Design a protein around this nucleic acid. Structure first.
Lengths: 181, 244, 341, 130, 195, 8
RNA sequence: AUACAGUGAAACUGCGAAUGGCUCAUUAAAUCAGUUAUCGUUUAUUUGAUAGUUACAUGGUAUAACUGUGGUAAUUCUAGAGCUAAUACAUGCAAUCUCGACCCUUUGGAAGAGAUGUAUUUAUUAG
RNA sequence: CUACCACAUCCAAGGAAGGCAGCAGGCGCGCAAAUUACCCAAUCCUAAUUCAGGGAGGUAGUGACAAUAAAUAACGAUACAG
């Protein structure tokens, strides 16, 4: 019976889902960032919890430790690369200060809304899911894509898109024809 | 089981082969031959997983019986022929000669050699004994029985064998200061000069070896192979010269 | 092996390959690298062979001459060293490097044809030694490379060798007269191309010259030469076929020529007759008869009779178009002998 | 237009060919058939079409590019010699062999297994008995 | 008279010219292929005489000239043919200029002592504004906005022009006639340099 | 090193 | 192909079928995990060495497949007659090397003297 | 393969012959669940051996056991009310 291939859950149910302020908070987060359901919020919270728990464990270690230095530097480098952590807050105490909202704007959906390609968060998700948006060479249809700084600088409409310079859509060409006939 | 096994699972195969785990369910079982299974690398793994000349085993089979591959100066047509340490593989069509020497990590390395170097081998002497009709002979790792050896040759010595004639060109006595290659243990692949031989009667002898970096280690005599004098190896060595 | 087995793969002896081998580069329709040239034929093939062949001797050869073959003017200016380096590496007779080198020999001749004439003598002598050297190590491919290299040189120097076609074969007499049947067979085919391109005039200065040579294995090699020069495709004959035979008949009937020449002509006639159809043989038949009619004399009466016996016997009377006129020739022969004939 | 590029070219005189990775860019086009590639490769490497084999092509997500493997044999004869039978049938160099499904073949093998000898005598015997 | 002989003839004449010009011959042949080896092989700066340079500032018609491109025929060693498009253009040096006035102009610079002489021109304007307003229909024969850059084909057969109008037309060198228009396919992909 | 070709 | 010679059903030989796969009832140093020895053993195969001790090729002491006659309700059931082969079955056949006078020639020839399988079992001798 | 012990199939009743949860597919309730499918093309293994084979293996079929990602709309204008 082949040795099992590793897999993991990307989210965990909160300790008390029904607490009123928690419901209001997830309502706010979803509406601000146009999330489909709470599952994305739980996934992001789980990721933040793991990261900040690692940061706390490292802080518990005495300074100048080889482990503290090595893994702390690695975590800070990853966090700044993903854009969550600013260049001038490259310290573990600031990693401890992160919030779910930060990862949320680091979602591609937020930037495609944000740069002016879309007027609104929901229109932005519609554009993403419809293959109208390209990172560099690559068309991305995943709203949850986490954008790097080099990556956010390269957001654009895809070449194949009708908005990116291609021919009009089936609807547009159909209406143009029926106007011609 | 009630007899010798005939199948080899991939996960059970020697780790140094670097066989891909998801490729299939079975790996080549090295056939009987000069070298032992765990210390041999079958020709298929060389011609496919190392040189990449062949894309599949059937290609390797065609290659072999086209007789372009010569192991040790002799044409071999077996896919799972157990080539091992110090073995010479010649591909005339590619004009290539390879000698099988483990790298520092312990894997057989693709070491290209010249034809003048490909013309011979080194063979560490395992046994020296008188055969029928009182004819002395020597037995090396690769199962070569060479008759009428020089009397000075003893066990643990290294005899330079010519491929065309299969005769001892020269020999090296096992002594302190000689240049040595490790063929087993955690130090497999390392190179260094002998310092001292610890002798334990009724037990495994231990040899101390010092590298070019002055670092010293200890290994069982069974994993010792004299390859020349210090600074004067009788073969071309792989990159890194067995350092670290 | 008329009936082929279901096996995808089948052993073939060296002799079997040699028998099937035929020296005729034109029939090979495979795409040739030297067709597509930017600078020269040599560079085009030379670049390809670096990619394919990894033989040692070819490796040093490429390094020695890579600088001097970049441009055609460079090749012409450095033609001497290119030939000297080329011949040197062939002499090693390393089969693994032969194929790239021999092809480059032909393309070298291709680049500077008229200029290769000064190299012509040395090049042929090198090939002769190689083909003789090819004997002790049996390798059909080496023979295939050797004779195609010769044929290519003939093709490129087709004009020049033709004017002095006698000189060309004088170099190649040892191969045509060699003990091995196949070397003479292969050597004859290369010459057959040159013979097939020879003007009727220059052919006579040839067709005479080989005949006094007849006066060991020269007779058999020459027989293969003319029949191969004559046969073109299955059940068909060459366009020049009539002109070659018309020349051959005149010297054969000429008294100065030895009787062995007439026997050769009989042997040639039978080989072409069995090979060729009725229709292809009509013009060949035609120019037989008038030559006999024109040259009928008492001195050459016996020679005419001998060839005529060959004509009637060859494939019985099936190949003969008209028997009546053969009677007319027979009547004229008597009116003008050897009783046995 | 469609651009074809070859990389990681390895000369394999041992199998007498050249192996390499094919990268084809085909903007505003679905993809390229193997025959079309084999054509282009044949003129590019100055070899016969029959000496060119191409396989394992995957178009990248979103389209516009595809990647596969290519082999160019030095000759057509050696290609027919080495190249796989199924691919020869793909290119038409070999004819598909018609065979029964393994069930019928194995059944027939077992049926022959119960029979000893040519069996013509059993045939004539049952004929005379009937 | 096969093409190989013709190459042999052209090569033979080429060597004779080198022999007439002149070890030395061997060096020059190497220099003929020095470009393939991607290294600097033209050391002539110290030999240049800047102080005696004959300076001239020939003006032109249009305001705010944006780019210039020069074409120099070069003999091809592989085929021994000049890069000139036609026999009339043998050893004729051409320079092409554009400005912000939407005009492409060609000049002849063969004579160094003399100065560039206008041959032909093409001017764009509002006549060429695209009606469709969809980018892919940006296939109008002429310019309708500022021209920024030019490149001349090494074969001497074409000259290509681009600017802030998100397009690339290639013109025939002889007549400056537009043969093809290549839209850039980006709302904000305006051509800035051509090489 | 490989080679490059373009068509259609 | 006037011995045959391509291909080749069937049949006799040769090799393999102790591999692969599947279930967990049993057993608390029983297997097992590490570790050591076989100077106490067998070992197809691979690999390298290894046998000078009628013959221009012996017999059916032989039959299959194959031809044909039959029995049985009936089989991977059958008997009687007739063939024909082997890497199947049996049989089996004017040399070399030493001591070397002559010290003839001083590599050298050379009188003469000599010597010359393997396997099994027992005994003995050297080692 | 021999005899013995049971089971069970044929018959002219004189005799003859019969034994896998390996692969698939079933029974075990009267209440309920993946195909008696395609290939030796791959990795390997056996042979008088490239070429023959291998329910070893591979491919495909089914399905809210689990797990990863996301559609079921997006953008404006106008009218009428408190």
């Amino acid at each position: 019976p082949r040795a099992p291939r590793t897999y993991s859950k990307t989210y965990s149910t909160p300790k008390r889902p029904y607490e009123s302020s928690r419901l209001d908070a997830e309502l706010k987060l979803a509406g601000e960032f146009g999330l489909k359901n709470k599952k994305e919020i739980y996934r992001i919270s789980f990721q933040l919890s793991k990261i900040r728990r690692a940061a706390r464990d490292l802080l518990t270690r005495d300074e100048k430790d080889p482990k503290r230095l090595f893994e702390g530097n690695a975590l800070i480098r990853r966090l700044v690369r993903v854009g969550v952590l600013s260049e001038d807050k490259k310290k573990l105490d600031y990693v401890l200060a992160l919030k779910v909202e930060d990862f949320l704007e680091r979602r591609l959906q937020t930037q495609v809304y944000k740069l002016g390609l879309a007027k609104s968060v929901h229109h932005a998700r519609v554009l993403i899911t419809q293959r109208h948006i390209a990172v560099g060479k690559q068309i991305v249809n995943i709203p949850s894509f986490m954008v790097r700084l080099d990556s956010e600088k390269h957001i654009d409409f895809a070449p194949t898109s009708p908005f990116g310079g291609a021919r009009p859509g089936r609807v547009a060409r159909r209406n143009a024809a029926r106007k011609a006939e | 089981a009630r007899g010798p096994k005939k199948h080899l699972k991939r996960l059970a195969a020697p780790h140094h082969w670097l066989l891909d785990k998801l490729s299939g369910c079975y790996a080549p079982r090295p056939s009987a031959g000069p070298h032992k299974l765990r210390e041999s690398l079958p020709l298929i793994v060389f011609l496919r997983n190392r040189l990449k000349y062949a894309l599949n085993g059937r290609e390797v089979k065609a290659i072999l019986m086209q007789r372009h591959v010569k192991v040790d100066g002799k044409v071999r047509t077996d896919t799972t022929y157990p080539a091992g340490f110090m073995d010479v593989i010649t591909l005339d069509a590619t004009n290539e000669n390879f000698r099988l020497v483990y790298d520092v990590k312990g894997r057989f390395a693709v070491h290209r050699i010249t034809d003048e170097e490909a013309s011979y081998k080194l063979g560490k002497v395992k046994k020296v004994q008188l055969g029928k009709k009182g004819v002395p002979y020597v037995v090396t790792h690769d199962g070569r029985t060479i008759r009428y050896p020089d009397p000075n040759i003893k066990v643990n010595d290294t005899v330079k064998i010519d491929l065309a004639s299969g005769k001892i060109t020269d020999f090296i006595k096992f002594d302190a200061g000689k240049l040595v290659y490790v063929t087993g243990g955690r130090n497999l692949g390392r190179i260094g000069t002998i310092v001292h031989k610890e002798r334990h009667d009724g037990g495994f002898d231990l040899v101390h070896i010092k590298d070019s970096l002055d670092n010293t280690f200890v290994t069982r005599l069974n994993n010792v192979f004299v390859i020349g004098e210090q600074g004067k190896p009788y073969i071309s060595l792989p990159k890194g010269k067995g350092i670290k | 092996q008329t009936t082929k087995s279901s096996k995808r793969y089948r052993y073939s002896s060296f002799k079997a390959r040699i028998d099937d081998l035929k020296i005729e580069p034109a029939r090979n329709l495979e795409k040739r690298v030297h067709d597509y040239v930017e600078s020269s034929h040599f560079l085009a093939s030379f670049d390809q062979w670096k990619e394919i062949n990894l033989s040692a001797k070819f490796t040093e050869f490429a390094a020695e001459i890579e600088h001097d073959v970049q441009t055609l003017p460079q090749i012409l200016y450095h033609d001497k060293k290119i030939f000297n380096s080329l011949v040197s590496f062939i002499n090693f007779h390393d089969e693994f490097s032969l194929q790239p080198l021999l092809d480059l020999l032909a393309q070298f001749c291709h680049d500077l044809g008229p200029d290769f004439l000064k190299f012509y003598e040395e090049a042929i002598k090198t090939l002769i030694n190689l083909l003789d050297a090819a004997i002790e190590f049996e390798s059909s491919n080496v023979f295939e490379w050797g004779f195609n290299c010769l044929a290519y040189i003939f093709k490129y120097l087709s004009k020049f060798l033709v004017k002095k076609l006698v000189l060309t074969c004088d170099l190649l007499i040892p191969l045509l007269s060699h003990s091995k049947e196949y070397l003479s067979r292969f050597s004859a085919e290369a010459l057959s191309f040159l013979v097939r391109k020879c003007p009727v005039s220059n052919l006579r200065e040839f067709v005479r010259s080989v005949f006094e040579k007849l006066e060991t294995n020269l007779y058999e090699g020459l027989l293969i030469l003319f029949t191969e020069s004559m046969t073109s495709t299955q059940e068909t004959l060459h366009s020049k076929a009539k002109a070659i035979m018309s020349v051959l008949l005149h010297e054969a009937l000429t008294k100065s020529s030895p009787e062995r020449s007439v026997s050769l002509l009989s042997d040639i006639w039978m080989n072409i007759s069995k090979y060729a159809s009725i229709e292809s043989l009509l013009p060949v038949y035609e120019v037989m008869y008038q030559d006999f009619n024109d040259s009928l004399d008492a001195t050459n009466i016996d020679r005419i009779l001998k060839v005529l016996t060959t004509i009637v016997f060859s494939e019985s009377g099936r190949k003969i178009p008209d028997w009546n006129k053969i009677t007319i020739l027979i009547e004229r022969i008597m009116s003008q002998l050897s009783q046995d004939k | 237009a469609v651009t074809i590029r070859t990389r990681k070219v390895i000369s394999n005189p041992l199998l007498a060919r050249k192996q390499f990775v094919v990268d084809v860019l085909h903007p505003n086009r679905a993809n390229v058939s193997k025959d079309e590639l084999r054509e282009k490769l044949a003129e590019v490497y100055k070899a016969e079409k029959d000496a060119v084999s191409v396989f394992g092509f995957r178009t990248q997500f979103g389209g516009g590019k595809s990647v596969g493997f290519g082999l160019v044999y030095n000759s057509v004869a050696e290609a027919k010699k080495f190249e796989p039978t199924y691919r020869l049938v793909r290119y038409g160099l070999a004819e598909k062999v018609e065979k029964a499904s393994r069930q019928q073949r194995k059944q027939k093998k077992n049926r022959d297994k119960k029979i000893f000898g040519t069996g013509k005598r059993l045939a004539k015997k049952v004929a005379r008995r009937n | 008279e096969n093409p190989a002989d013709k190459r042999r003839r052209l090569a033979k004449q080429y060597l004779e010219n080198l022999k007439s010009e002149a070890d030395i011959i061997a060096s020059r042949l190497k220099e003929d292929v020095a470009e393939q080896q991607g290294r600097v092989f033209r050391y002539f700066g110290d030999k240049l005489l800047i102080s005696e340079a004959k300076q001239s500032f020939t003006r032109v018609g249009e305001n705010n000239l944006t780019c210039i491109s020069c074409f120099q025929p070069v003999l091809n060693k592989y085929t021994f043919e000049e890069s000139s498009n036609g026999d009339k253009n043998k050893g004729r040096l051409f320079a092409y200029t554009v400005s912000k006035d939407l005009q492409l102009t060609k000049y002849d610079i063969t004579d160094f002592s003399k100065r560039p002489k206008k041959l032909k021109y093409a001017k764009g304007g509002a006549k060429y504004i695209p009606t469709s307003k969809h980018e892919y229909e940006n296939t109008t024969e002429g310019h309708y906005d500022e021209i920024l850059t030019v490149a001349a084909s090494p074969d001497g057969k074409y000259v290509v022009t681009g600017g802030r109008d998100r397009k690339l037309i290639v013109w025939s060198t002889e007549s400056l006639s537009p043969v093809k228009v290549i839209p850039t396919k980006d709302r904000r992909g305006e051509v800035l340099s051509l090489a | 090193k490989g080679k490059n070709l373009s068509f259609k």
